[PDB]
Amino acid sequence: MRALVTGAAGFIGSTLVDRLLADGHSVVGLDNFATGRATNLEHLADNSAHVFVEADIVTADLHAILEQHRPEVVFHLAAQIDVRRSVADPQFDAAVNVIGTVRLAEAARQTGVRKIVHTSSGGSIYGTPPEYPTPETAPTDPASPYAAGKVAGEIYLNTFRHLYGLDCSHIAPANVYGPRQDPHGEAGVVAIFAQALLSGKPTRVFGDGTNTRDYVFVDDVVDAFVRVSADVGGGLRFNIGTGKETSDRQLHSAVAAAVGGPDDPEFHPPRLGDLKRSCLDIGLAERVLGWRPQIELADGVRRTVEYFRHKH
Amino acid sequence: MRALVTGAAGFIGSTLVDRLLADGHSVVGLDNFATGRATNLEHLADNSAHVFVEADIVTADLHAILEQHRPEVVFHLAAQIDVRRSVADPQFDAAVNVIGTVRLAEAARQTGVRKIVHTSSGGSIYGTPPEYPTPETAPTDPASPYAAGKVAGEIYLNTFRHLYGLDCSHIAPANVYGPRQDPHGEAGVVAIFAQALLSGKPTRVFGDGTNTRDYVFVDDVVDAFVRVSADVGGGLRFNIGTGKETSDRQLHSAVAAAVGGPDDPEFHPPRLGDLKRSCLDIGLAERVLGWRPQIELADGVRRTVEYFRHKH
Ligand SMILES: NC(=O)c1ccc[n+]([C@@H]2O[C@H](COP(=O)([O-])OP(=O)(O)OC[C@H]3O[C@@H](n4cnc5c(N)ncnc54)[C@H](O)[C@@H]3O)[C@@H](O)[C@H]2O)c1
Ligand SMILES: NC(=O)c1ccc[n+]([C@@H]2O[C@H](COP(=O)([O-])OP(=O)(O)OC[C@H]3O[C@@H](n4cnc5c(N)ncnc54)[C@H](O)[C@@H]3O)[C@@H](O)[C@H]2O)c1
Ligand SMILES: O=c1ccn([C@@H]2O[C@H](COP(=O)(O)OP(=O)(O)O[C@H]3O[C@H](CO)[C@@H](O)[C@H](O)[C@H]3O)[C@@H](O)[C@H]2O)c(=O)[nH]1
Ligand SMILES: O=c1ccn([C@@H]2O[C@H](COP(=O)(O)OP(=O)(O)O[C@H]3O[C@H](CO)[C@@H](O)[C@H](O)[C@H]3O)[C@@H](O)[C@H]2O)c(=O)[nH]1
C-alpha cells in the first residue's frame, strides 16, 4: 500500500518508516525537523519506494501534498512531544497537536485517504486515573496542555469519521524508549540516563523519585501501528504499553546495571504537568489486534544502552 | 465584582452584559465584531460601569488585557458559531474555538481570575446520543468540527483547573433564541423565520423538516450564566435547555402564528454537519444551580417577533 508518515524524521516515526518499507509499502515521510533528525532517515537516500517532504503540518499545503502522493493510510506521529514545553507554551503545543491534526484530517478527507492512525498519549491522557492498570474505558482527564491536545486530536478525528467516513484509530503509547530516541532531548528518561551514565555525567530524578511509568520498547509500538492500519479497531483507541510500573529510581538502577559503574542519581524538585503514576491495561490491543509487547524492560534497556554506547 | 465577557457584542454576550450591569457588576466587554455588532452595546456608551475592548481572542495580547482589567470571572462567549461554516473551514473554527480558549485560559491563570465560565454547545456535543433528553453523563460524540472544538474547549479548561486551580464551569446551551439574534445569516432559525415572515420574504426548512432542536430563551440562558459564576458547580458542565423537541416544521408554524403570517416554507436539501435531533436533560442545572427555564417557546417567539417590529 501507499503510506504517509508525519513526524517521519522522529524516533518512533523513522522506525515505523523502516518497518513499512520492509513490509513492502511505499512511504512518504513528512517532517519539519522541530525535534526529528535527518540521520534517522539518511540510509533511505537511494530507496525509490521512499520520498521525504520537509513540511510543517501547521502551515504546509497538506491538501496538495496528499493529492500528489495519494496515501491510503496516514500515520500521524508529528507533534510537540514535551509535557513541560506544553506548560510553558500551551498555545504552540495546541497549534501543532490540535490545529495540525485538524488540517491533516481536512486534507485527508478530500484526497481519498482510507484511514488516519493517530498517535495519542496513553501515558498522560487519563491524568490521575481511577485505577491501574488503566483501561481505555477509563475517562480521559488530562492534567497538562500536551495531554489535552492529544485528547482533542482523537475527538477531531472521531468527528471526521462521523462527518465523512474517514476511518481512524488511536494508538495511545505508554512511555516509549529504544534506539534513535534523542539522547539530547528534553524528554525520554531512558535515553537521558543511558547517555549520561555512559558519559559519566550527573543524573537526576524528580521528587522522591517514586514517580512511575510504563516503559514499552519502540519495536513493539511500531508493530501496533502496523496492526491497526488495517480495517480493524476502527473508531477506537488502543493503549500500547506493558502493564508494568517502573519508578524513576528503579529505572536508574536498571540502566546503571546495563551501562556499569555507579547508581547514585541526584534528587531535583517536581515538574508541573508531570503525573505521579502511569500504567496501561493492554487487554484490548491483545483481544482486538492480537498485539502483545515482546520486549521486557531489562532486555530493552540492554538493547538501548548498547545502541547508545556504539553511537557514542 | 469585576467581570469580563468575550463575545460581548454578540446576541447572548450583550444580553449577559446588560444583566451583569443590572446586578451591580463592572463589566469589560471584548469582541472583534466577526459576527457581533456595536449596535448591541451602543446603549451603554455613557455607563461608567462598562468598558469595551476591541480584540481578537486568537491573536490579541489577552494577558495584557486581563492584567489591566483584572476580572474575577471571565464569561467566554467569543466563538465561531456556525456549524456549516465549521464544516467549510474546520481550521478557522478550531483556531477561534480551541486556540482562542487556550490563550484566554493561559492569560486568566496568570492574572488571578477566580473562574472562567465557558460556553459549550449542549445541542451538538453529544452528536447522535444514546438517549433523549440527553444528560451530561452521556459521552460527548461530536459530528461537526464546531461541536468538536466546543468539547476541546471544555477539556482544556478542565486541564487548566488541574494545573493551576483555575476554576471553570461549562454552560452548554441548546438552541438559544430571542431579541438581538441576527436574522440575516444561516444560523439562528427563530430570528431568520421571524424577520423573513415580517418582511414577506421566502423561508425554508431543510430535508423533510422533521429535524428537532431544543429552543431555550436568551434570558433563561443568561440566568444560568449568572448562577454558575459563583463558587458553585466547579468543574461541571450544565445542559441549558428546555428538554422539549420542536421540529423545523413545527417551529416555522409557531413563528408564523406569532407574526400572523403564512406558514408555507420552501423545502431545501439537508445541511452536512446538522444533527437530526437535539434535546437536553436539564436536571443537573436544576439540582446544582437551582436553575429552570421560565420562558415557553410560544411566549419567547412572541417576544422575538416584537423585537423585530420595534427595531430602530
Ligand atoms: N516517546 C514516547 O514516549 C511517546 C509516547 C506516547 C506518545 N508519543 C507520541 O509519538 C509521536 C512520536 O514521538 P517521538 O517519541 O518519536 O518523538 P520525536 O520528537 O522524535 O517525534 C516527533 C516528530 O514530529 C516532528 N514534528 C513536530 N512538530 C511538527 C510539525 N509542526 N510539522 C511536522 N513535523 C513535526 C518532529 O520534528 C519529530 O520528527 C508523537 O506524536 C508523540 O506525541 C510518544
Ligand atoms: N445561539 C445558540 O443557539 C448557542 C447555543 C449554544 C452555544 N452557543 C455559544 O454561545 C456563544 C455566543 O453565541 P451567540 O448566539 O451570541 O452568537 P454571536 O455570533 O452573536 O456571538 C459570538 C460573538 O463572539 C464574537 N467573536 C467571534 N470570534 C471572535 C474572536 N476571534 N475574537 C473575539 N470575539 C469573537 C463575535 O463577534 C460575536 O459577537 C458562542 O460561544 C456560541 O458558540 C450559542
Ligand atoms: O532526567 C530525568 C528525566 C525524566 N525522569 C523521569 O522519567 C519519567 C518520564 O519522563 P519523560 O521521559 O520526560 O516522559 P513523559 O513526560 O512521561 O512523556 C513521555 O511519554 C509520554 C507517554 O504517553 C508521551 O506522550 C510523551 O510525548 C513523552 O515525552 C518521569 O517520571 C520523570 O520524572 C527522571 O527521573 N529524570
Ligand atoms: O432557514 C433555516 C435555518 C435553520 N433551520 C433549521 O433550524 C434548526 C436550527 O438550525 P440553526 O439555527 O442553524 O442552529 P444549529 O445549527 O442547530 O446550532 C445552533 O444551536 C447550537 C446549540 O448548542 C449552538 O451551539 C450553535 O452555535 C447555534 O448556531 C435546524 O434543524 C435547521 O434545519 C430551518 O429550518 N431553516
Automatic annotation (TrEMBL), chains A, B:
Keyword Acetylation recorded: no
Domain of life of the organism encoding this protein: Bacteria
Keyword hit for Coiled coil: no
Key words, A-Z: Lyase
Enzyme class at the top of the EC tree: lyase
Gene3D superfamilies with a match to the protein in the record: NAD(P)-binding Rossmann-like Domain, UDP-galactose 4-epimerase, domain 1
InterPro entries given in the database record: Epimerase_deHydtase, NAD(P)-bd_dom_sf
Every NAD-dependent epimerase/dehydratase domain range: 3-241
Enzyme Commission no: 4.2.1.46
GO MF, one example: dTDP-glucose 4,6-dehydratase activity
Family: Belongs to the NAD(P)-dependent epimerase/dehydratase family.
Protein's recorded name: NAD-dependent epimerase/dehydratase
